Symmetry: C2
Subunit: 85 residues, 2 copies
Amino acid sequence: KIVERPEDFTFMLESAKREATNFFKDDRVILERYVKRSRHIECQIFFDKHGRGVFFFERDCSVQRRYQKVLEEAPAPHLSMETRQ
Amino acid sequence: KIVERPEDFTFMLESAKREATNFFKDDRVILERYVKRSRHIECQIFFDKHGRGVFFFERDCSVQRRYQKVLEEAPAPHLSMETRQ
């Protein structure tokens, strides 16, 4: 129900119980954090066999259709240096 | 009342009317955007008299006591390059 508002106690249980109808499946319910927006990041890394390595620069794969990569950018635009670190 | 929740119509008017009590002043009320957090920024600039100039780097003055400057940092840490531009 896109219930991003905390202090919700009379609608979440009603929503779950109406979900259980016609979609009983297993009565077990799992709770997680809900994120409104999503942008994919993927840093690169490298390691020898003598205990020494160094991470490469980040990357972005926001654009993808049907789980197929389309176009990507190695420098994640709008990414603070400190974060990169 | 720190009313950051939109779709508020039965509490904002009650809050304003209870504010008017013992603090009538003028009945005119002004509405603005409310920001939860504040951090001060101040960019520098330079201009000749022959129509040509160039902005210097940003700055930060977050730390101040009783409107008195205490400690400041020219490179605003955690500031994306694009924003600087």
